[PDB]
Design a protein. Structure first.
Length: 188
């Protein structure tokens, strides 16, 4: 099962529905749910930090990102919070607007397996990762965003700037399935 921290964004239920659609159970929990409380249930195979408006009211995500012994996928805000947690930088970039963005996949990684090196993702660029944390690498970029995706090189932690959980993201379910694979799910 995948635990979804609700950071307040409006696509949180889409994450549940997208996971379920590929046959993965998930549970939406307040973003103030302690790490120890999430990890107390061995059914929890991984954590998704959802999108949301305010990085200050998602502070608890920083502890989870740093100290969880489970795989983590941060989505938009979640991606930014992982960056902060590991000493990266984030800031305002473009202007708030959801647009189909052409995303280029820069290297072979588990997150983008069976995803074309070029695909259209549903994204806002209100904010972005400005400096990638020490020990992380860039997985993907667009013409307006240098860090559309990243991973921790030595921990199973992933960030995506865009929303794979909306139907408008090409291969968005494949990207969720790939995360679930790292969490020990198989899709044969």
């Amino acid at each position: 099962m995948i635990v979804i921290l609700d950071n307040g964004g409006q696509y949180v239920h889409r994450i549940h529905r997208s996971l379920k659609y590929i046959g993965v159970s998930s549970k939406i929990v307040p973003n103030t749910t302690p790490l120890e409380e999430i990890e107390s249930n061995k059914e929890v195979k991984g954590i998704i930090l959802s999108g949301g408006p305010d990085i200050e009211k998602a502070k608890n995500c920083i502890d989870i990102a740093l100290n969880a012994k489970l795989p983590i996928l941060g989505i938009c805000l979640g991606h930014q919070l992982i960056a902060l947690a590991y000493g990266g930088e984030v800031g305002r970039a473009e202007a708030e607007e959801y647009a189909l963005t052409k995303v280029y996949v820069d290297k072979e990684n588990d997150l983008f397996k069976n995803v074309p090196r070029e695909f259209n993702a549903w994204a806002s660029h209100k904010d972005e990762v400005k400096k990638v944390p020490e020990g992380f690498e860039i997985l993907a970029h667009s013409d307006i965003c240098q860090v559309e995706a990243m991973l921790h090189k030595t921990k199973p932690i992933f960030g995506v700037q865009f929303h794979p959980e909306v139907a408008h993201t090409e291969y968005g379910n494949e990207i969720l399935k790939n995360f679930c694979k790292v969490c020990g799910y198989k899709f044969e």
